[PDB]
Design a protein around this ligand. Structure first.
Ligand SMILES: NC(=O)c1ccc[n+]([C@@H]2O[C@H](COP(=O)([O-])OP(=O)(O)OC[C@H]3O[C@@H](n4cnc5c(N)ncnc54)[C@H](OP(=O)(O)O)[C@@H]3O)[C@@H](O)[C@H]2O)c1
Ligand SMILES: CCOc1ccc(-c2cccc(NS(C)(=O)=O)c2)cc1-c1ccc2c(N)nc(N)nc2c1
Length: 157
């Protein structure tokens, strides 16, 4: 299975200055639950933002840099390489990867951040005419998680 995993705000903002615009621990819990024991494919900038491979899953980085060889990370140099990866593969960002893959993936696991943030990178437009809502679950708010958010699982029609 090939899936997108993304958090985007009401205007599809996903990033600002190579980091997430929001602090939302619940989204990370969501990422952990979905991707632990599976595979993440990410662009080079996204990887450098995180700074290290995420534990307990396969981390694959897409880059044109032929000098890229980082411990605990597998490297690929083409979109076509993604299709050779076994198991459940999650496209993990950033904007360039999402743009390249939104028409190819089976489904999407979106955290809708129900706010309007300043962004410099965006998730591409999509329409519910193309995507069935498999589930929609409101995130619980507390002291640590103060921005309303909704977890959507969309499946291509
Ligand atoms: N909210 C979210 O769900 C989320 C998730 C991930 C990232 N982000 C945000 O997204 C932003 C980064 O997005 P971005 O688009 O600037 O960068 P990105 O997608 O993370 O990485 C871009 C880089 O990926 C490589 N790449 C992409 N397609 C390639 C291809 N077909 N062949 C070879 N290399 C390819 C290139 O690396 P080289 O230049 O090294 O060749 C390219 O410069 C940041 O603000 C980050 O915080 C948000
Ligand atoms: C571009 C910068 O983005 C990040 C930086 C740090 C961490 C992060 C920090 C600590 C621990 C973990 N691991 S965990 C708990 O998520 O499994 C991740 C996670 C993200 C990050 C990266 C991609 C995504 C993505 N595709 N989707 C969603 N819903 N959230 C993300 C969060």
């Amino acid at each position: 299975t090939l899936s997108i995993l993304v958090a985007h705000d009401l205007q599809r903002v996903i990033g600002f200055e190579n980091q997430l615009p929001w602090h939302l621990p619940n989204d990370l819990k969501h990422v952990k639950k979905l991707s632990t024991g599976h595979t993440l494919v990410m662009g080079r900038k996204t990887f450098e933002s995180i700074g290290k491979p995420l534990p307990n899953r396969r981390n694959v980085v897409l880059t044109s840099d032929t000098s890229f060889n980082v411990e605990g990370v597998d490297v690929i140099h083409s979109i076509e390489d993604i299709y050779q990866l076994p198991g459940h593969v999650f496209i993990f960002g950033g904007q360039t990867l999402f743009e390249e893959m939104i028409d190819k993936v089976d489904d999407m696991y979106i955290t809708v951040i129900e706010g309007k943030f300043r962004g410099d990178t965006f998730f591409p437009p999509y329409t519910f005419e193309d995507w069935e809502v498999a589930s929609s679950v409101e995130g619980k708010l507390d002291e640590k998680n103060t921005i309303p958010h909704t977890f959507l699982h969309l499946i291509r029609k």
